Design an enzyme around this catalytic site. Structure first.
Site, mmCIF file in Angstrom:
data_model
loop_
_atom_site.group_PDB
_atom_site.id
_atom_site.type_symbol
_atom_site.label_atom_id
_atom_site.label_comp_id
_atom_site.label_asym_id
_atom_site.label_seq_id
_atom_site.Cartn_x
_atom_site.Cartn_y
_atom_site.Cartn_z
ATOM 1 N N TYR A 115 -6.446 -9.109 -5.370
ATOM 2 C CA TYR A 115 -6.566 -7.774 -4.818
ATOM 3 C C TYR A 115 -6.336 -6.706 -5.857
ATOM 4 C CZ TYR A 115 -1.471 -7.175 -4.820
ATOM 5 O OH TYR A 115 -0.147 -7.090 -5.183
ATOM 6 N N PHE A 159 -2.745 1.527 -7.746
ATOM 7 C CA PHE A 159 -1.300 1.384 -7.769
ATOM 8 C C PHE A 159 -0.829 -0.051 -7.999
ATOM 9 C CE2 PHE A 159 -1.099 -0.329 -3.561
ATOM 10 C CZ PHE A 159 -1.999 0.387 -2.787
ATOM 11 N N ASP A 160 -1.695 -1.049 -7.810
ATOM 12 C CA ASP A 160 -1.284 -2.433 -8.025
ATOM 13 C C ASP A 160 -2.498 -3.323 -8.060
ATOM 14 O OD1 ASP A 160 0.439 -4.642 -8.345
ATOM 15 O OD2 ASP A 160 0.762 -4.857 -6.185
ATOM 16 N N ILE A 217 1.434 -5.908 5.318
ATOM 17 C CA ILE A 217 1.125 -4.744 6.127
ATOM 18 C C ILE A 217 0.045 -5.106 7.145
ATOM 19 C CG2 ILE A 217 1.938 -2.994 4.526
ATOM 20 C CD1 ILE A 217 -0.987 -2.631 3.588
ATOM 21 N N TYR A 225 2.170 2.080 5.015
ATOM 22 C CA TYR A 225 3.533 2.571 4.808
ATOM 23 C C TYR A 225 3.839 3.885 5.531
ATOM 24 C CZ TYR A 225 3.318 -1.280 1.590
ATOM 25 O OH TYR A 225 3.144 -2.551 1.060
ATOM 26 N N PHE A 245 -7.788 -1.514 -0.294
ATOM 27 C CA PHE A 245 -7.619 -2.731 -1.064
ATOM 28 C C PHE A 245 -8.954 -3.414 -1.238
ATOM 29 C CE2 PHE A 245 -3.022 -3.434 -1.435
ATOM 30 C CZ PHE A 245 -2.527 -2.568 -0.479
HETATM 31 C C1 LIG Z 1 10.920 -9.183 -1.405
HETATM 32 C C2 LIG Z 1 9.871 -8.615 -2.398
HETATM 33 C C3 LIG Z 1 8.446 -9.156 -2.101
HETATM 34 C C4 LIG Z 1 7.472 -8.839 -3.206
HETATM 35 C C5 LIG Z 1 6.468 -9.597 -3.676
HETATM 36 C C6 LIG Z 1 6.102 -10.979 -3.175
HETATM 37 C C7 LIG Z 1 5.618 -9.072 -4.813
HETATM 38 C C8 LIG Z 1 4.152 -8.770 -4.376
HETATM 39 C C9 LIG Z 1 3.161 -9.643 -5.188
HETATM 40 C C10 LIG Z 1 3.796 -7.275 -4.605
HETATM 41 C C11 LIG Z 1 4.694 -6.320 -3.784
HETATM 42 O O1 LIG Z 1 4.640 -6.655 -2.385
HETATM 43 C C12 LIG Z 1 4.221 -4.868 -3.985
HETATM 44 O O2 LIG Z 1 2.918 -4.778 -3.388
HETATM 45 C C13 LIG Z 1 2.305 -3.479 -3.418
HETATM 46 O O3 LIG Z 1 2.066 -3.062 -4.761
HETATM 47 C C14 LIG Z 1 0.999 -3.720 -2.705
HETATM 48 O O4 LIG Z 1 -0.074 -3.693 -3.293
HETATM 49 C C15 LIG Z 1 0.988 -4.024 -1.267
HETATM 50 O O5 LIG Z 1 1.037 -3.037 -0.541
HETATM 51 N N1 LIG Z 1 0.949 -5.293 -0.787
HETATM 52 C C16 LIG Z 1 0.857 -6.444 -1.697
HETATM 53 C C17 LIG Z 1 -0.379 -7.304 -1.350
HETATM 54 C C18 LIG Z 1 -0.438 -7.613 0.164
HETATM 55 C C19 LIG Z 1 -0.440 -6.276 0.938
HETATM 56 C C20 LIG Z 1 0.859 -5.481 0.674
HETATM 57 C C21 LIG Z 1 2.043 -6.124 1.328
HETATM 58 O O6 LIG Z 1 2.024 -6.249 2.531
HETATM 59 O O7 LIG Z 1 3.058 -6.543 0.560
HETATM 60 C C22 LIG Z 1 4.179 -7.128 1.265
HETATM 61 C C23 LIG Z 1 5.108 -6.032 1.752
HETATM 62 C C24 LIG Z 1 5.658 -5.067 0.722
HETATM 63 C C25 LIG Z 1 5.391 -5.994 3.058
HETATM 64 C C26 LIG Z 1 6.310 -5.053 3.765
HETATM 65 C C27 LIG Z 1 7.482 -5.900 4.329
HETATM 66 C C28 LIG Z 1 8.452 -4.979 5.100
HETATM 67 C C29 LIG Z 1 7.704 -4.280 6.253
HETATM 68 O O8 LIG Z 1 8.637 -3.463 6.969
HETATM 69 C C30 LIG Z 1 6.571 -3.413 5.680
HETATM 70 O O9 LIG Z 1 5.897 -2.828 6.796
HETATM 71 C C31 LIG Z 1 5.467 -1.479 6.606
HETATM 72 C C32 LIG Z 1 5.563 -4.295 4.887
HETATM 73 C C33 LIG Z 1 4.907 -8.175 0.368
HETATM 74 C C34 LIG Z 1 3.895 -9.231 -0.119
HETATM 75 C C35 LIG Z 1 6.166 -8.829 1.024
HETATM 76 O O10 LIG Z 1 5.811 -9.854 1.959
HETATM 77 C C36 LIG Z 1 7.086 -9.519 -0.001
HETATM 78 C C37 LIG Z 1 7.895 -8.569 -0.828
HETATM 79 O O11 LIG Z 1 8.102 -7.415 -0.487
HETATM 80 C C38 LIG Z 1 3.222 -2.441 -2.707
HETATM 81 C C39 LIG Z 1 2.651 -1.003 -2.734
HETATM 82 C C40 LIG Z 1 4.604 -2.440 -3.408
HETATM 83 C C41 LIG Z 1 5.196 -3.866 -3.317
HETATM 84 O O12 LIG Z 1 6.468 -3.989 -3.969
HETATM 85 C C42 LIG Z 1 7.571 -4.062 -3.045
#
Ligand SMILES: CC[C@@H]1/C=C(\C)C[C@H](C)C[C@H](O)[C@H]2O[C@@](O)(C(=O)C(=O)N3CCCC[C@H]3C(=O)O[C@H](/C(C)=C/[C@@H]3CC[C@@H](O)[C@H](OC)C3)[C@H](C)[C@@H](O)CC1=O)[C@H](C)C[C@@H]2OC
Ligand SMILES: [Cl-]
Ligand SMILES: [Cl-]
Ligand code: NA
Length: 108
Positions: free
Chosen positions: A27, A37-38, A57, A83, A100
């Site tokens: 992605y 942003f990523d 998300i 978010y 995305f």
């Molecule tokens: C514990 C740290 C654990 C971190 C991991 C495994 C590193 C990852 C490889 C990258 C990070 O997740 C990075 O990705 C982003 O850059 C990005 O591009 C993005 O938005 N996503 C990533 C791709 C899939 C869609 C989406 C997503 O849903 O990510 C999940 C996410 C952040 C879900 C939340 C959970 C709480 C809930 O309240 C909230 O609802 C509103 C949704 C993620 C995979 C978690 O499942 C796991 C983690 O957070 C955001 C901008 C900032 C992020 O940093 C924190």
């Protein structure tokens, strides 16, 4: 809508993600103006997730479910399916529609 799926390249038209499967993707995440942003492509490391666990998300939960294996699509996700009014500290402004570019590589 929560998510709009626009296809860049078609998938197999047959194999759609189900609960219990691991989705493996590349992605790039950007704002509506394309500002990145990523990206997993930049890490040369694919990203893995599963449906039904609130671990992505909601726009991914509902968008990637509409993709078949091999598809590349643009997912346009409303703030409430991402978010929301908060945004994401350090990265995403409040009230941001996200785009995305997702490639569904395989199901494991
Ligand atoms: C514990 C740290 C654990 C971190 C991991 C495994 C590193 C990852 C490889 C990258 C990070 O997740 C990075 O990705 C982003 O850059 C990005 O591009 C993005 O938005 N996503 C990533 C791709 C899939 C869609 C989406 C997503 O849903 O990510 C999940 C996410 C952040 C879900 C939340 C959970 C709480 C809930 O309240 C909230 O609802 C509103 C949704 C993620 C995979 C978690 O499942 C796991 C983690 O957070 C955001 C901008 C900032 C992020 O940093 C924190
Ligand atoms: Cl996973
Ligand atoms: Cl998991
Ligand atoms: Na997790």
């Amino acid at each position: 809508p929560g998510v709009q799926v626009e296809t860049i390249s078609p998938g197999d038209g047959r194999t759609f993600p189900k609960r219990g499967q691991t989705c493996v993707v590349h992605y790039t995440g950007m704002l509506e103006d394309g500002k990145k942003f990523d990206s997993s492509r930049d890490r040369n490391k694919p990203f893995k997730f599963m449906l039904g666990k609130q671990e992505v998300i909601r726009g991914w939960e509902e968008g990637v479910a509409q993709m078949s294996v091999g598809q590349r699509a643009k997912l346009t996700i409303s703030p409430d399916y991402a978010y929301g009014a908060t945004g994401h500290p350090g990265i995403i402004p409040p009230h941001a529609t996200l785009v995305f570019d997702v490639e569904l590589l395989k199901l494991e």
